[PDB]
Design a protein around this ligand. Structure first.
Ligand SMILES: O=C1N2C=C(c3ccc(O)cc3)N=C(Cc3ccccc3)C2=N[C@@]1(Cc1ccc(O)cc1)OO
Length: 192
């Protein structure tokens, strides 16, 4: 196991292409713009509803999603195009990396906590391969049952073969923020 690299690379076509792929994935209608309203609706009225989240869990998850995407520029009643979106990610990456460097919880970690809570009815605090496939399909970020397995092959699992928020946060920092080579493949062949 290795530490995460905090060095950014916002100019790398690979990092920009990754967020472009996701932006397009979020831009359902392909109108070239998204709104915090769509992101929150996807989070609360789609994902949380279909996973069977309680009212409380759904609210906490919404609060975290709202804070996260506000981090990268989004806002209610405001259309955000890719250019602004990308610039938003640079600021968020910088802001979250600054918090990590001071041992303050990051927005990416807090989003993770909300997601894991939905699958934590017994106290384990982890997510099993089967629950991730569920999340992958419902959220649409990894509908491929195969890619989800690759996610679990890629990540370091606990003694039960289960994924915990600490490891997933490590991976996401590298995948979404630093374009760390060690993170490549986190989502299988589903996200470049
Ligand atoms: O990381 C995640 N995501 C990143 C992006 C995303 C979006 C745009 C970009 O440019 C880059 C990345 N989009 C979605 C899907 C989603 C979007 C909006 C509302 C709800 C869900 C998403 N779901 C997560 C949630 C998560 C977070 C931390 C964890 O430890 C575990 C799980 O799972 O991997």
């Amino acid at each position: 196991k290795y530490a995460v690299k905090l060095q950014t690379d916002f100019d790398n076509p690979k990092w920009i292409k990754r967020h472009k792929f996701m932006f397009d994935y979020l831009d359902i209608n392909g109108n070239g713009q998204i709104t915090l309203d769509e992101i929150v609706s996807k989070a609360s009225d789609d994902i949380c509803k279909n996973l069977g989240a309680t009212p409380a869990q759904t609210q906490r998850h919404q609060d975290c999603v709202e804070a996260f995407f506000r981090g990268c520029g989004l806002e209610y009643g405001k259309e955000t195009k890719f250019p602004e979106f990308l610039e938003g990610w640079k600021n968020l990456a910088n802001a979250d990396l600054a918090k990590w460097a001071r041992n303050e919880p990051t927005l990416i970690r807090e989003w993770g906590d909300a997601v894991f809570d939905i699958f934590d009815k017994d106290g384990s605090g982890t997510i099993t391969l089967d629950e991730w496939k569920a999340y992958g399909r419902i959220s649409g970020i990894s509908p491929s049952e195969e890619d989800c397995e690759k996610t679990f092959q890629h990540c370091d699992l606990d003694n039960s073969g289960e994924l915990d928020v600490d490891e997933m946060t490590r991976q996401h920092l590298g995948f979404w923020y630093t374009l760390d080579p060690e993170a490549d493949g986190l989502y299988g062949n589903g996200v470049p």
